[PDB]
Amino acid sequence: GNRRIRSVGEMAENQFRVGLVRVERAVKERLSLGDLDTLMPQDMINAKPI
DNA sequence: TGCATCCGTGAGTCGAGGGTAATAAAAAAACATCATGGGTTGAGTGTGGTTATTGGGGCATAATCGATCTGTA
Protein backbone atom coordinates (compact mmCIF):
# COMPACT_ATOMS: atom_id res chain seq x y z
CA GLY A 1 0.00 0.00 0.00
CA ASN A 2 3.00 2.31 0.38
CA ARG A 3 4.65 1.30 -2.92
CA ARG A 4 3.59 2.58 -6.32
CA ILE A 5 3.98 1.32 -9.88
CA ARG A 6 5.37 3.86 -12.34
CA SER A 7 4.87 2.87 -15.99
CA VAL A 8 6.40 4.16 -19.21
CA GLY A 9 3.89 6.96 -19.78
CA GLU A 10 4.76 8.49 -16.42
CA MET A 11 8.52 8.68 -16.96
CA ALA A 12 7.92 9.87 -20.51
CA GLU A 13 5.79 12.74 -19.20
CA ASN A 14 8.42 13.49 -16.54
CA GLN A 15 11.13 13.81 -19.20
CA PHE A 16 8.82 16.00 -21.27
CA ARG A 17 8.35 18.25 -18.24
CA VAL A 18 12.13 18.47 -17.92
CA GLY A 19 12.31 19.50 -21.57
CA LEU A 20 9.68 22.19 -21.08
CA VAL A 21 11.58 23.49 -18.06
CA ARG A 22 14.67 23.72 -20.27
CA VAL A 23 12.64 25.62 -22.87
CA GLU A 24 11.25 28.04 -20.27
CA ARG A 25 14.78 28.72 -19.01
CA ALA A 26 15.50 30.39 -22.37
CA VAL A 27 12.04 31.78 -23.15
CA LYS A 28 12.10 33.78 -19.91
CA GLU A 29 15.03 35.83 -21.25
CA ARG A 30 13.96 35.69 -24.90
CA LEU A 31 10.67 37.44 -24.15
CA SER A 32 12.28 39.96 -21.79
CA LEU A 33 15.05 41.05 -24.17
CA GLY A 34 13.50 40.36 -27.58
CA ASP A 35 11.46 42.26 -30.13
CA LEU A 36 7.85 43.19 -29.40
CA ASP A 37 6.19 43.22 -32.83
CA THR A 38 8.08 41.24 -35.49
CA LEU A 39 8.88 38.30 -33.19
CA MET A 40 7.30 35.12 -34.49
CA PRO A 41 7.05 32.32 -31.88
CA GLN A 42 8.67 29.75 -34.20
CA ASP A 43 12.10 31.36 -34.42
CA MET A 44 12.45 31.86 -30.65
CA ILE A 45 11.83 28.25 -29.55
CA ASN A 46 14.37 25.42 -29.69
CA ALA A 47 13.46 21.78 -30.29
CA LYS A 48 16.90 20.36 -29.46
CA PRO A 49 16.53 20.15 -25.64
CA ILE A 50 13.17 18.35 -25.65
C1' DT B 1 33.41 12.32 28.71
C1' DG B 2 29.79 12.16 25.59
C1' DC B 3 28.55 14.24 21.34
C1' DA B 4 28.21 14.36 16.33
C1' DT B 5 31.16 13.77 12.26
C1' DC B 6 34.03 11.76 8.71
C1' DC B 7 36.24 7.87 6.56
C1' DG B 8 37.13 3.20 4.31
C1' DT B 9 34.97 -1.37 3.59
C1' DG B 10 31.91 -4.85 1.14
C1' DA B 11 33.35 -11.57 -5.27
C1' DG B 12 33.48 -14.62 -8.56
C1' DT B 13 34.06 -15.85 -13.74
C1' DC B 14 31.02 -14.16 -17.54
C1' DG B 15 27.48 -11.36 -22.77
C1' DA B 16 25.86 -7.21 -25.73
C1' DG B 17 25.17 -3.28 -27.10
C1' DG B 18 27.77 1.25 -26.68
C1' DG B 19 26.91 5.76 -27.65
C1' DT B 20 24.23 11.60 -26.53
C1' DA B 21 24.26 17.10 -26.07
C1' DA B 22 20.93 23.49 -22.87
C1' DT B 23 23.90 27.41 -26.02
C1' DA B 24 27.03 31.04 -28.64
C1' DA B 25 28.62 37.39 -33.84
C1' DA B 26 30.40 39.05 -36.73
C1' DA B 27 33.71 42.47 -39.75
C1' DA B 28 38.49 43.94 -40.74
C1' DA B 29 43.59 43.44 -41.25
C1' DA B 30 47.54 40.74 -40.52
C1' DC B 31 50.25 37.03 -40.64
C1' DA B 32 51.65 32.12 -41.17
C1' DT B 33 51.90 28.20 -43.98
C1' DC B 34 51.03 24.41 -47.14
C1' DA B 35 50.26 23.30 -51.78
C1' DT B 36 51.67 22.98 -56.67
C1' DG B 37 54.83 23.71 -60.44
C1' DG B 38 59.06 24.28 -62.68
C1' DG B 39 64.06 23.69 -62.65
C1' DT B 40 69.04 21.84 -61.27
C1' DT B 41 71.58 17.31 -59.11
C1' DG B 42 72.09 12.93 -59.11
C1' DA B 43 71.34 8.39 -59.13
C1' DG B 44 70.49 5.31 -61.10
C1' DT B 45 69.23 1.23 -64.38
C1' DG B 46 70.40 0.18 -69.69
C1' DT B 47 73.31 -1.46 -73.57
C1' DG B 48 76.53 -2.13 -76.34
C1' DG B 49 81.44 -3.27 -76.87
C1' DT B 50 86.96 -6.18 -76.86
C1' DT B 51 89.30 -10.35 -75.16
C1' DA B 52 90.14 -14.68 -72.02
C1' DT B 53 88.89 -18.91 -74.06
C1' DT B 54 88.00 -25.08 -74.21
C1' DG B 55 85.49 -28.99 -76.80
C1' DG B 56 85.11 -30.39 -81.88
C1' DG B 57 86.49 -31.46 -86.48
C1' DG B 58 89.58 -31.74 -89.01
C1' DC B 59 94.42 -33.60 -92.53
C1' DA B 60 99.32 -35.82 -91.58
C1' DT B 61 101.79 -39.55 -90.65
C1' DA B 62 101.80 -43.73 -89.57
C1' DA B 63 99.82 -48.64 -89.26
C1' DT B 64 97.00 -54.14 -89.89
C1' DC B 65 94.00 -56.53 -92.36
C1' DG B 66 92.02 -58.35 -97.29
C1' DA B 67 92.18 -60.34 -102.20
C1' DT B 68 96.04 -63.47 -106.34
C1' DC B 69 100.79 -64.78 -109.84
C1' DT B 70 105.92 -66.27 -109.12
C1' DG B 71 109.60 -69.66 -106.42
C1' DT B 72 110.83 -74.55 -103.67
C1' DA B 73 110.53 -80.96 -102.74
* Residue A43 DSSP one-character state: G
What was the structure determination method? cryo-EM
**Alpha-carbon distance A43 to A41, whole Å?**
6
Distance, CA of A7 to C1' of B72, in Å: 158
Distance, CA of A37 to C1' of B55, in Å: 116
Q: Footprint of strand B, using CB within 7 A?
A: A 22, 26, 46, 48-49
* Residue A36 DSSP one-character state: S
Torsion sign across C-alpha atoms A48, A26, A23, A36: negative
Rg (chain A; Cα; Å) = 16
Distance, CA of A47 to C1' of B7, in Å: 45
Q: What is the resolution of this structure in A?
A: 3.2
